[PDB]
Amino acid sequence: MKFAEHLSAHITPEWRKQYIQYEAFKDMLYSAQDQAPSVEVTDEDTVKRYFAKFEEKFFQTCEKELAKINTFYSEKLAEAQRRFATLQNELQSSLDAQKESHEERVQHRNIKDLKLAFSEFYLSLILLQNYQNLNFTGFRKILKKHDKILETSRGADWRVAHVEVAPFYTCKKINQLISETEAVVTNELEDGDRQKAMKRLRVPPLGAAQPAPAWTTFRVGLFCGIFIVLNITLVLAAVFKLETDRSIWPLIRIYRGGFLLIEFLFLLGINTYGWRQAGVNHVLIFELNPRSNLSHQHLFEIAGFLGILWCLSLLACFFAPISVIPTYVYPLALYGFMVFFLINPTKTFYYKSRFWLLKLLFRVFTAPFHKVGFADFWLADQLNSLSVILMDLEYMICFYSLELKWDESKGLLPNNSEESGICHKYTYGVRAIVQCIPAWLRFIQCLRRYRDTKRAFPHLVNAGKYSTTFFMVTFAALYSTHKERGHSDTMVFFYLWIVFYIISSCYTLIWDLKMDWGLFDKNAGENTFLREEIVYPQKAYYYCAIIEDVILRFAWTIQISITSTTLLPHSGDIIATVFAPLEVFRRFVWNFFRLENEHLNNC
Amino acid sequence: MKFAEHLSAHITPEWRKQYIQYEAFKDMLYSAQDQAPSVEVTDEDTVKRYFAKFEEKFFQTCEKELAKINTFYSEKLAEAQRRFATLQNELQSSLDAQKESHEERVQHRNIKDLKLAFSEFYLSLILLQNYQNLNFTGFRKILKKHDKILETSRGADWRVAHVEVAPFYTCKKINQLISETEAVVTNELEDGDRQKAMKRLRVPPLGAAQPAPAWTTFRVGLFCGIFIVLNITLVLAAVFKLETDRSIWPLIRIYRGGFLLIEFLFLLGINTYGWRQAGVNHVLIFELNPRSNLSHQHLFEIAGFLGILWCLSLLACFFAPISVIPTYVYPLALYGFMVFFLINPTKTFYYKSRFWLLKLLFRVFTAPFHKVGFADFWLADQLNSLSVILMDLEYMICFYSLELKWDESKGLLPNNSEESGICHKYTYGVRAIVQCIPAWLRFIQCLRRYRDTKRAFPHLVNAGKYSTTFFMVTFAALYSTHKERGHSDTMVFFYLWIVFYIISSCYTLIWDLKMDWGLFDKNAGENTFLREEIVYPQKAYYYCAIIEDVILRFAWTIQISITSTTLLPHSGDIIATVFAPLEVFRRFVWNFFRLENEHLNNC
Ligand SMILES: O=P(O)(O)O[C@H]1[C@H](OP(=O)(O)O)[C@@H](OP(=O)(O)O)[C@H](OP(=O)(O)O)[C@@H](OP(=O)(O)O)[C@H]1OP(=O)(O)O
Ligand SMILES: O=P(O)(O)O[C@H]1[C@H](OP(=O)(O)O)[C@@H](OP(=O)(O)O)[C@H](OP(=O)(O)O)[C@@H](OP(=O)(O)O)[C@H]1OP(=O)(O)O
Predict the structure, then answer these.
(1) Could you tell me the distance, in angstroms and rounded to a whole number, from the CA of residue B398 to the centre of ligand 1?
(2) Where do the SPX domain residues begin and end (chains A, B)?
(3) If DSSP states are collapsed to H, E and C, what string results for B415-441?
(4) Which of A212, A500, A202 is nearest to B215 (CA)?
(5) Nearest CB neighbour to B222, from listed A212, A214, A224
(6) Contacts of A212 in chain B (CB under 8 A)
(7) Could you give the residue ranges of the DSSP H alpha helices within A2-101?
(8) CA A174, CA A77: separation in Å to the nearest integer?
(9) In chain B, how long is the greatest CA-to-CA distance?
(10) How many angstroms is it from A138 CA to the middle of ligand 2?
(11) What Rg, from alpha-carbon coordinates, does chain A have?
């Protein structure tokens, strides 16, 4: 309400402290009004002296904040012109190089980068202009409010004697700067095409939140409703219309991956909504284009659509109304549709989003030959917690290639055959390597980062933490195969195994609480066990995260060990399936604090 | 982009012609720019005289439109001043009467009515201010556009010489007016409470469409999705899970009403959406409070929720999980929930809407005594199209009270008993009166209107129209009972019956095309077979309405005749079911044109 929430919505995520503290002056004026001693206990001289002293303190605070505004604006303007001169020099160099093939491609990439730089400079200039306008509006509003409450005209005199003569308000150099940038872009860059110049230099109202179209919200609601009703009917159909002829392992073992993917997309949508609400400049961190970024609603829509596809495919797998090929087409059809959706080459269905995502995925998969950005290793750590999809895909390809009789029906082939359990076994080695692929990719990425930076800490320690999983999985496999062979010394390999269990968790957990989040700092001060500046209002969120992460790390390591070792022949698959949709929740809660730590400590 | 859509959304409907014809100015300037031939083709003298003559014509047109705007503003200000004087006199009289029981209640209703009058006055003055500001903005906008396209500075000089001195902008009496009204409201009425004074006089941004919350759209989507999935599963369950041993009539004949009502609500939501989009001032016509009106989204939400309840009740009726009572609680429970939803006495679940609708329904059901508004007889005619709900309700009461053995099970009592078919008969004759109730109410309303106005040409004939249903139903009942008795002269009563068929349709259809819509106008002729002015862009809508209404009138009259005559033992309920959900569509298509015609002629 009023200018208060307007300013609060128009806060720049970077310079939040530099803005006028409308709330502070608001509450201190109400504090002035609230005291109000008894009407007849003392002379009106005391009341007027109280009014005068509080007015003097109000003027002192206003002058202090005004001086801070002047200094901040002058400094900002200083680097504004210095950056303008630097970009003008670069533009002149590029133009004179062009005026006088590989050279043409270099000029093309340079001018495109220059256009992007001019775009961000124009955003900076308009941000400064909005800064000045918001400060002026806040000053006029607070002075009017004060003149109203104190029923005096002193606020107007203070404003006219201070504000309209303030250097920040009197300086119009920002307008000449933006006009010169616009003219340069129109003339030198666009060759007189003013329309294209503006179209590239548009600035959508980022300050006014985001005008989400009603159609997107309606579609999200429709998809959510259809998904929940399909889920309910799936539960009822599974409970009632299922008979007993086979233990239904393959169906869950195949659809667990789709369930994990859908849950991950939903949680990432919640994650980005919280990121936007908290004020963390995530778009800058991911070097995304500020013109076009995906809000949470699109992620919710995509998650709902994939959930619909998965649920209908699984329900068709149960019921199987009528066909010629009985049941082993639905999972294949669903996965084919998903993979084709991901690689759609037309300019439809978020073409830029899919292109950028697949480019990032190719970069992260070929990481040993690429640099390290924040969008790269974050996706690598995202994939590190989703080894279950790779496991399920390998199991599905094994089942459909070797075990399943392709030209047959039903799909409950006898388990008494020797070929039953070919990849329910582990001596093939096709389980340890698949599980360790994410760890290997992440570790080699960290090693390349260290080599590029030439700085041992913290990259070597990080590489060790990523490499502990190698020992974990390999020794679990050794124990499993030696138990299969029934050797006398096999039990010995159990002992140190448990040791390497602990040296994993208590290790990585520490890495999760010192460098990833920067908590437990020596300068906690008033906030025991926490950090000085926390964006989220409540510390109970931090407490629940710190109490859940310790359990979830043990859960993840034990679940990956049992998945790759396949002991406990009955309950092993059940424990793996039940523990799978918990590490994803851990990965969801981890991102909040990871980025709120990175945003403050840029580093 | 430009201010085109800005004004097109911000133009007040009832003064749309008075605003700037900015679009015409755009297109004429674009035509002027495009018509210029090549430089080499024509001499520069011809080019310059072209610019000179078109500039002169542009200035002439702008002078004409500004003169019209000044005259309009002067007249508006004069009537605003006279209205202000009148309301000041009324306030003075009220306050001096108050200063010097029934008298207190009269004073209370006077002060509330005066508060409403001041609200309307403040809204009108703010509308005038918005008009003036938009006109000034449009002038400066088109002038700078002309200056940029003609690369001349003549526009600025013309603006400062004409627009700056223009009487509409120079007259600042509007601000003194609003300040005086605000001061009077704060002091005389609110007794110094400025906060309550402005909150009662707050004006939401009606010009900027409507900021619909995203939560409402999400809820609408969720309800629509759940409804469509429940509909599909109900269709499949009815096709497969239902057998045929005792027919399904005693179920559809009770569950038709919920579908009818839900369809009516959905179509009414469509009506209000189209009404808002086309610009027809429907809120003024219904004397609704302009600050609190229901957009289409709320109607869609209510329709979806009722659809969910009805579909769930029907689905539970099919499968019928059994604890004690087999099947005859679901319809009663659903109807009880609906009626309790309508009569909720708390302040939740649309507190104002339900109270207003209940008051209107009571007023229309006490038609012979209370007066006539617009919403009154509009709702009367709206209910005249839904006699099927009353038919189904009385049939439900008849079945549950007499035929149904409530202390039994199943719900498929044999039809071989003598009492069976009594409720399928008409010996009591209740069908005729139940069907003829809406006609009687509408006739009484028209008779009261005629008596009050003492003018027979537009009222007495209106009453005479609604008496044909009486003769139709009575003659149908006579034919049915004489056929049941098998008298020799029975067939004779058929003959005139068919006659009174035609004298119904060809009569009321004419009434639907002359006074209800104002079509076929002799004074017209700009558009063949249409009126002088239309609001919807396409005449094909009028053509399809005029081609469908002729069929629908015959359909409605034959369906009511067959419903109340109890003939065609096999196809009777079938024809009733297939014809019922289309008369509501006829009412839906009728409302649009009825209100666009009532908006202009003002009968
Ligand atoms: O792209 P828009 O948002 O519609 O901007 C239009 C206009 O473009 P159009 O004439 O095609 O409508 C001008 O662009 P050009 O004609 O010069 O190519 C532009 O110019 P300036 O910013 O330099 O004034 C000006 O933008 P703005 O909204 O900031 O005033 C504004 O002009 P019009 O509303 O008069 O058309
Ligand atoms: O919050 P609003 O009801 O929209 O109005 C507030 C304010 O009330 P608050 O004291 O609760 O903040 C003033 O109320 P009064 O003390 O004068 O009764 C009012 O004053 P004016 O309308 O006379 O200016 C002014 O409204 P406006 O937005 O038109 O300036 C605006 O105050 P602020 O926006 O400056 O905080």
Answers:
(1) 71
(2) 2-207
(3) CCCCCCCCCCCCCCCHHHHHHHHHHHH
(4) A212
(5) A224
(6) 214
(7) 2-9, 22-35, 44-99
(8) 8
(9) 104
(10) 14
(11) 31
